[model samples]
Target chain A: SGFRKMAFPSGKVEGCMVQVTCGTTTLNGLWLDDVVYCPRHVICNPNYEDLLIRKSNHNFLVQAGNVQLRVIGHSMQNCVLKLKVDTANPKTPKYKFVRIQPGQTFSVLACYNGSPSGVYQCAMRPNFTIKGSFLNGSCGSVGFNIDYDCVSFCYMHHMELPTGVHAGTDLAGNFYGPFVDRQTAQAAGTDTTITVNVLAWLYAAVINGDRWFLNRFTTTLNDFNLVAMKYNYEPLTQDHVDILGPLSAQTGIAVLDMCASLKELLQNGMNGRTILGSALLEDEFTPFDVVRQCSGVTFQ
Target chain B: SGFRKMAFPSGKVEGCMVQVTCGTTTLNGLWLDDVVYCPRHVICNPNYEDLLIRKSNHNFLVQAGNVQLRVIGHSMQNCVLKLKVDTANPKTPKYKFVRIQPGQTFSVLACYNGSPSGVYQCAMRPNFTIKGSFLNGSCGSVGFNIDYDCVSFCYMHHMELPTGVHAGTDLAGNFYGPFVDRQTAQAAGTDTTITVNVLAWLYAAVINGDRWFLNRFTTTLNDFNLVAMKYNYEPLTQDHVDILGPLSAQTGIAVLDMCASLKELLQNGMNGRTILGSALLEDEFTPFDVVRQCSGVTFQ
Candidate 1:
């Protein structure tokens, strides 16, 4: 009892290597409609031995919010499995969701309530009007045995994650570390210059920097790289460029340009053709592919 | 000429670590009155070439709200630094003076218009009017040296530092990471629970969930021993409390009291205190030198 649709890109699209997680909604599956609250120096855990111990883990009360259920997995729009919040209910509950395709990876911010006593629900309805669709013949269907509390707990796994420290996570969403050879640096260099590029794609999605926190400036060309990576757009795209202009306008930074050490790898050749064949490079220059690399340019 | 100070606890203090440079100031043996500024970023040797081939090695901009500066080292309390902003003249003029002291760090938001563009100097000056004494006698006469901007560039040797990574910095500085083996988790199932204890320190430091950004959390505490080997801690007065509190708080859920664990260890004399006093155990407990043993909790 779910409907899915296709937006555009699917799987880990080829480009500069930005990790994109799609939004998920429950059409009729496990509904994440509950919330948990805890206070400073307190954590919520089901395994605590007694009231005092349990209080340490489950110190906060989880107020239940109206749940919007959606089936998330393959056979959905561009890997976007969105959680559409329910407005009709008096108890307005919100849960963070992601749009990751199968075999792909992504991250989310599992926000905690300001006060430990605040409660959010984990309620789900049996007849939730969720939908699932397929643009391709092979997109897969999801199972219903999954637990809602388990999924919500997944986000907690990422809290307090060491900045710049991310490794391949397990299926259950546990983050691993020591993935990269060197530890992420602690400070930005004095001479770090930034440049903005690949901003056009944000327009396609209608998502802007004002919608986010990116500020505009031209120093390190890496900003462009970041723009590309954030969306997994590399090798450039009309869809990406379309999306970029709006995001730049929103963020108040230059939308797009070709620049820097990264430019070397993305630069093309004859007839405005890149060094690689048009097909190989198509996945190389899109904004969706190149955004994560931009983190390199950010003030550390 | 450069001045000297001794640091207690001999390692990075939790919230503050200071960066110092050695160089002779223009004045000869003058009670060097100068203000110090936290660096925006270190610039490269201005004569730069091929940004791609040889991009500025060290470069960064002042992006955060107010730039903060601190003087940390042993007996730094006797040392003093200060700052000034001369908004009066747009053209070059003598800088106004302000003073800062050790065991303390000050902050400023005004940008300095100095050489090589905008370099703010947080200069230092002695509290000429105050009186105090130290262990070695009245604190030795101190001096401050200003040569080339300490914030914008390293006078001694220039190495391009990466963003978000500073070496030997403490809990309070903006740039951090390039992490050193801080400390290891205490032994598990040995009367104490070993958890991967992380700290937010302040609203600014990265590593844990952004105190500002809601520092993230995790539950996977594996390789407790290895993680111990990997990280180390130099817990001064409050740092140990900070870490142990969280560990014990979490362990309370398991019906185990961390304090009880410590008390048991104390009774059995399994750790540092054993050497000073005999254990209450029938089996011989290992004796350890408290000061020496707790210094570095890492295994070779």
Candidate 2:
């Protein structure tokens, strides 16, 4: 709840860096001119020098994840005190924050980490300054870790599974995809094969279809061409020919990169025409005879 | 959502320009431009051009107060579209968003007024430019106005009670505050209070104990003041004058503000004193009296 910005030295007394006053005697003293990284502390700006706080004589309960103690300064090097929290039993609290430096703020947040019934406490010690190391001060005491029943959660990315994973094929002499988690399957295990069986019959196209090469889709509509309409034409224009030159002449030049037999075929080949007079095929295109003679060596 | 920022030539546009456009065809060539003031009514904005939202063609079921439409622009105008819901019951719409502007936003707010059942439907027209009237475009038929439920408020301000509407006092001679229903004083038909009773209790050192300006807390420690005893006290000087100067000054100012008539008491020519020789006077620190006296006066 306290914030400050300082720009100058605080105390001017010689050999006296920091002093803790308790009536007539000094409870503690610290040589603040040098040394840094004190574990627990508090410091105020010159403007707030007159602002005094009276800490309770008895230590109060320390809430969960709250900063019950503090080391105040511009950075860790100027740390004036070292504060800590303690707990009973197996759970060692994973401190939510460590040494905070310039522009960084430290706060103690109370939260429930699943466990409900437990005891928690806090502890603190002064800086190692000449004045701080001697005094015995109470930082905080044990308090109820009462949860207000407030809940918070982070929504992690969910696995938006479209469908269950299919394992393998099944029998009945009728092919069927294996049921995933057949026990939980709607028809109890039996419906597993039944569903796969339905899907098997539904895939008539893939079941009886022949393998083919990848074909381009429609340019204007961006639609997939039906297997039967794979030969529909889109003519090359004069502008395209001007840029690329004659197709057959390019084919003869392309043969230079192949074997003698391929070169001979290309030299006598019809521009870019296929066996069925389609513009897609070339002399280098895989021949039907090659496919018929080859043993299932399919190419995509 | 397409975010398009449109700006017009003229610095200022008129109010409520009606535009009618069906697809690309302007249904009405004439734009209704005018300066109309309809308070609490929805209005369109100026420079609202080139905002064309194309939605799928489908029948919609719109609910009241469920949608919030917002338009950002200057020189705006209000445009309330006249829509009728419950096409079947034409006569009784149950509820309607009385004022709606195209290109302006209106919330499908939870049914507020007019509808007995909370269920109400609505359609929103974003605000429009002042340079033109209704764009003469027929939009997709929008549906809204579902009667979900009604909210009942059983209370009202006491002062709002009609004249001659006071209830009889109790046997203890205590005046009963305004009652909402008829049944009262051991009878039951309908009864309710018209005022909210705010309760508070006054607290002060003198009022709670016999001690006159004595601090029992001082007994817990060996110190003249809080700052003098705390180990965290600043400055090597333990001068009570330095510490008490600021601390007592604040306390003195607070006492004076609380006891505004302190000087008047001295001039009254009366003699009253506490066991410690302190003046016996009323504690008047809090401003609760001012708030309580003025809060419910207008209602009464």
Candidate 3:
């Protein structure tokens, strides 16, 4: 669920200034970061045609044959919506538009030449849209969708064929592209998904590090500001001090001091009010999520 | 020079229990954790020989050759401080002691056969001591040192050799072990150092994650205890709140609330007196230092 708890510190607490922006909207009050989007690539035909031709047109097709074609949308519809056919020996210069019903599975390819040498290639138009969410709040309903009507091809590039240039040579000692199978293509799809997510979180961390500036020496003033501004909800309880006590004893480092300072700040200002919610902050964001995401290499 | 600022929380400001340990001594009051020791392998003649062949009966016309030997100690004089020579072919079931003055070097080779096939492998007793620091305060002076009278060899075992059984065969069609040069060895050494340090910190984080339990939901109760006990040295100031406010806005997450809560705790608990340290608790130690100390592949 997009409702995962926020682990980072957010808002202008002391010296810290953090802001989460998605597209043009800044989700400050909502306390949310944009969810990552992953794209998958798959192959499918979006247009099919089978046209019937008669001698009614002198400028049109004269020869006749039963031409059959099929198309199906894989992920979306807009990109492969419109279809057209082009003949090798053409009477007219441009491609001929094939009329397709609204939700029909295929269109008849009639009135095509019977000549075996008359090769006909198909083409299509492109477009698509998708949406997703980030958090549990109302602002989390945001998503990204797109449509494309640009140039498109209708040829099947089978994933199993060696169609592109690769590192090795062929059986005839000819150097060409390597072969790719469906398994390999599937792996690529998954890799892209993981890569995108890792990159997104990594980018977030980099941007946040600008102010939080995690270090080993003196606690950054921003860190102090963050704690001071946010410690009201969860006051210094004796139980907390109990845990912190041993942690300090466990490691004799300055982190203990920072922990101590953090404790004293809370203990001295104990109040009976506890705020219940998840807030993201630069300090709490996933700094190492990238490493966690891409721990595996998928090679099919 | 080793008195650096403590980089971690210490004592039980409210719930911390920090202590330093050196051998059997646990410097509970002193804040310190010991640093690790790195050993470099080098060839050295731990012992040199200079003996006179004084036979009572048979005198095999000893050649007039100079037999010189010297020894010097860098940190200790009690070990690797003696020399001896033995001959097996002559059936002399005894070792000849060599007397060498201090601060002298250049051990000579005398009374040896000119035979090319003579198997003469030199061996010696080795010993050395080293000391270092981990953190600040008096206990920081405590370091590890040792003297060894262990078996020693005079030849160098360059680290670059591919001495183990690997998957490939070497050139010249021979299935022998691959030779590792100084460059490769040096690279391996540097890689090992980086790997060790990385592992140490990584391990530390894993252990800490168990308690801190990074999440986006409510702040773990342990974190509260940690700060409440030690928030004295640095009180939650206004600058801290100002920064936290923006940080909350920036990320649109409740970690701001956590930070704010921390600040409020400190703001409410501001006082002149600092608590005496030492409240041994599980949550305060520098979990990462252990990893940092022995990041090397060595399990021990």
Candidate 4:
């Protein structure tokens, strides 16, 4: 779970509008809960592929994928309904936005790209107007879910996680990490399940501001390069130590800032690294996942 | 000069949407400033009539009233335009929402009651959604322009204002007064202009949460009623003293409790009293404006 609650006017209400901006996209969608909603950015998705939207307006039904929508409308009341789908990209995954009451369906319209609702006009003396800079519409964000995946790898492999990783989400909502493990440790795949590198998984979760993994990522740092051979990899990478080290020591605005060094920290350490095969994705890619290093794995 | 700023995402930015609610109306229109935007509640308008909305869809132009709109497409921009006007209410006032860049024009649409924009379709998982209870649409609100209007009346009648009136918008954003001046103060429309009464003007401004007039409504109060030569009317109304007096004295949840007992104070006094002939209004069905006493006035 990331530390922020994306929706406003907290609590049970109606006609709630969702506001979430991811990179260049600003989601102006509606939310029912975590289940029937938009995931502001593909980077904000879970570690799996979810939601294939089958969209329509008239005689609409449920069914769907990425970049499209499925509006399952049945029973209705004082409100109207519109279904939107962008099916130009065949590479887009399947997804759906199903909302049915099993009563009688109300008015439904189909919009290919997007649609519209209310018109507000005002005539007057020389006054003022304010329209916030809004670009692409969005679905809010999702919670994080890759804790035990990393934890199980640590315990089963007789290795350990980074130190003090539990108390994460510091001032800028940045991370402390699974900063252990080098290569040349577990030569074969006999012990742990063969998956991906642990560090790369961490990088994906961290960049999306997920605290669930960080809070549970505490297991004690072990020198897993040698014996277990645990002494094979270094506990802390010098690359990280060089950058993240002084970020904490800075006595000026860094201490009071909101993720002041977030981008810099990621660029300096995790950016170019690969984190593939994970569903909880970013706009594009990933690298590290499971911690079991195969025998032929070199260049650690 | 209402005490509230309805729009969020404060300060100058683009695509800024307005938020203001009056009675059952929750304004989801746009705002330019004190002069050009929608008045959440017609009760929020200045003393003068403004805005004639001429609504349309294609090739729409500027022009027209209550429940309607005017989209003057004489400009250019990245955003599209839609106009909504409810001309059904022939009894309604004239209003317009014209936005022109003088360069070119975008798109235009006509929505009778209102229009819509941006189709928000999202394929969701078992998550959550929160849509706030949004009822009737609305225009933001306007500032108060009745301070000097009321002040001119008070001074010309040789009567002062209520005590400590400048320090209004108290614990509950309540009022202090034009609580001075009872009957027999001013004989005819000789000294002062023949527009309206002193107290009624204040009443209209007060209910709509306008504080601009409250701060400037300062002049020495007088004992306007006489009795056995002591003919000055009481400075404070018994109803106000009864309700508003104890409010100031009560403690805890005090300053932290914003406008705690606002409604109760409003009802205890100044509810059904007539405040006609003023543009800054409220949804009322009462009919009283002039105040004549010599052989005419009494309580309603």
RMSD of 1: 24.4
Residue B234's lDDT in candidate 3: 21
DockQ for each numbered candidate: 0.01, 0.00, 0.01, 0.01
Residue B16 in model 1: lDDT: 15
lDDT of 3: 0.19
- The number of clashing residue pairs in each candidate reads 153, 67, 145, 136
lDDT of 3 by residue, A1-300 (tens): 011111111000101111122223221110111111011111112121111121111112111123322211111122111111122221111211223211111100100011110011111111110101111111111110001111111111112112211111111112112322223442211000111121123233322222122234344434543454454322223333343333233333233344333334344532332111111111111212222111211100
TM-score to native of every candidate shown: 0.20, 0.12, 0.14, 0.16
The candidate 2 chain B region of ten consecutive residues with least summed lDDT is B2-11
lDDT of each: 0.20, 0.18, 0.19, 0.20
lDDT of 1 by residue, B221-265 (tens): 222223333323212223334444442343232112222232333
How close to the true structure is residue A202 of candidate 3, measured as C-alpha lDDT?
A: 26
- Superior by TM-score: candidate 1 or candidate 4: 1
User: Which order, best to worst by TM-score?
Assistant: 1, 4, 3, 2
Instruction: Please provide, for model 4 over B1-300, each residue's C-alpha lDDT reduced to its tens digit, 9 standing for 90 to 100.
Output: 111101111011111233322234333333232111232122211221121122123233212212223333222111111223222223222222322111111111101112221111111001111111111231221111011111000000011122101111111112122221232332221111111122332332343333232321122112211110121212333332333322223321121111212222222432323222222222111112111101112110
Runs in model 1 lying further than 4 Å from the true structure: A1-237, A241-300, B1-83, B86-159, B162-164, B167-227, B230-242, B254-300
Model 3's CAPRI class?
A: incorrect
Model 4 over residues A1-300: C-alpha lDDT tens digits? 111101111101112223322234333333332222322121111221221132114333212212333433322111111223322223222222222111101111101112211111110001111111111221121111112111000000111112101111111112113211222222211122101113333433443333232221122213221111231222333342333323224322221121222222222433322222122212111121111011011110
Alpha carbon deviation, residue A200, candidate 1 (Å): 11
Interface RMSD of candidate 4, in Å, is 26.8
